[PDB]
């Protein structure tokens, strides 16, 4: 056992927004000096494609190389659940190594999005929590972000998606804002991207009462 291979999927935002370029990354490590030559072959659904980029091998601090091949993918094939196959072949590999990956299969379920105001108890602090519950969606690939007056608010943290008991996923996204902004009735918004949503997108807003 010399080399080792890892296939990574595209970023959720990149698969969802037609204007970003989504890509699957194949990464070979423990590439001996003795045998540096590495061949990458890609197949979408068992049919080989040939426009993958192979970044020049870069050198690791433990006397091994690392080589990565990157295949950029069509937003549709990915959302249609097509299968990406990376085959790494090396002169010191008993046989070429195969890793294949893809989006999860399952009828896409649209998320429900709820914004929730800060707890009354929280309104003693000088900063508050604006909350965004997003649940019911499938598969787990989603992206969430907040904004106000068409400007991104950047002091938010979001949860990894959690598996609910009816087999879909939910998550929360917590936006911290200065209390005063909230009390003055500014309006904030939770943006959500997901394939099962119409045009991959929905937005929910909240503000004081």
């Amino acid at each position: 056992g010399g080399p080792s291979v890892f296939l990574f999927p595209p970023k959720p935002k990149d698969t969802l927004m037609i204007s970003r370029t989504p890509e699957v990354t194949c990464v070979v490590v423990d590439v001996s000096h003795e045998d540096p030559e590495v061949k990458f072959n890609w197949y979408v659904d068992g049919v080989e494609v040939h426009n993958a980029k192979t970044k020049p091998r870069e050198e690791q601090y433990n006397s091994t190389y690392r080589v990565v091949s990157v295949l950029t993918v069509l937003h549709q094939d990915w959302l249609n659940g097509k299968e990406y196959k990376c085959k790494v072949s090396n002169k010191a590999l008993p046989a070429p190594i195969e890793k294949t990956i893809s989006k999860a299969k399952g009828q896409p379920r649209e998320p429900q999005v709820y914004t929730l105001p800060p707890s009354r108890d929280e309104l003693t602090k000088n900063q508050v929590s604006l909350t965004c519950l997003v649940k019911g969606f499938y598969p787990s690939d989603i992206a969430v972000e907040w904004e106000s007056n068409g400007q991104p608010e950047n002091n938010y943290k979001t949860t990894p998606p959690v598996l609910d008991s009816d087999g879909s996923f939910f998550l929360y996204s917590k936006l911290t804002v200065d209390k005063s902004r909230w009390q003055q009735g500014n309006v904030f918004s939770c943006s959500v991207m997901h394939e099962a949503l119409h045009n991959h997108y929905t937005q929910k807003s909240l503000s004081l009462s």
């Binding site: 969802l16 927004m17 037609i18 972000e145 991207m193 119409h198 045009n199 991959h200 997108y201």
Partner: peptide, 29 residues
């Protein structure tokens, strides 16, 4: 119809009179 996120095109669809759905509008994208 089309959706925009902070000025960036997200996706766009149209009505396809046949089926009750909005299919991906590839022309526009």
């Amino acid at each position: 119809d089309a959706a925009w996120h902070l000025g960036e095109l997200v996706w766009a669809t149209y009505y396809d009179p046949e089926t009750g759905t909005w299919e991906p509008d590839w022309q526009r994208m």
